[PDB]
Amino acid sequence: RYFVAMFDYDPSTMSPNPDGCDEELPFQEGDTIKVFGDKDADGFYWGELRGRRGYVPHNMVSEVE
Amino acid sequence: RKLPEIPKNKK
């Protein structure tokens, strides 16, 4: 259930969603994220990084393979 | 809920 961030993602400045900061995980390139279950209809994984859980966009991350 | 843009200067 591990994914690697291919880009930096700062939801506060980069999210297109109004609740992005509060609901989406911030990460930098090369961070490894713990994903639970599968990606939702919106294209977001539910993930964990540094003691925090939140939505993770699939297009910013790559599954470990 | 909407997906973010991949920054073009990083891609």
Author numbering:
A (entry chain A): 1318 to 1382
B (entry chain M): 153 to 163
Which lines from the publication concern this structure?
RBP, via its second and third SH3 domain, is known to bind synaptic ligands such as Ca2+ channels and RIM. We observed the classical poly-proline helix that allows for mainly hydrophobic protein-peptide interaction in all three structures. In summary, we find that the SH3-II and -III interaction surface of RBP serves as a multi-functional platform for differential protein interaction with either other AZ components or the transport adaptor and therefore, motor-cargo linkage.
Finally, in order to get a deeper atomic insight into the structural basis of the binding of RBP towards Aplip1 in comparison to its synaptic ligands, we crystallized the Drosophila RBP SH3-II domain together with both an Aplip1 and a Cac peptide, and RBP SH3-III with a Cac peptide. We detected the same hydrogen pattern between the protein side chains and peptide backbone in the structure of SH3-II with Aplip1 and Cac. The equivalent residue to R1687 of Cac is R153 of the Aplip1 peptide, which forms, by contrast, a bidentate salt-bridge to D1336. Whereas the C-terminal portion of the Aplip1 peptide is folded in a short 310 helix, the N-terminus of the Aplip1 peptide adopts a random coil conformation with hydrophobic interactions to the surface of SH3-II. Completeness of the model given for the 12 complexes of RBP SH3-II bound to the Aplip1 peptide 149TRRRRKLPEIPKNKK163. Both SH3-II and SH3-III single domains showed a binding affinity to Aplip1 peptides several fold stronger compared to either Cac, RIM1 or RIM2. Notably, the same RBP SH3 domain (II and III) interaction surfaces are used for binding the synaptic AZ ligands of RBP, that is, RIM and the voltage gated Ca2+ channel, though with clearly lower affinity than for Aplip1. A point mutation which disrupts the Aplip1-RBP interaction provoked a ‘premature’ capture of RBP and the co-transported BRP at the axonal membrane, thus forming ectopic but, concerning T-bar shape and BRP/RBP arrangement, WT-like AZ scaffolds.
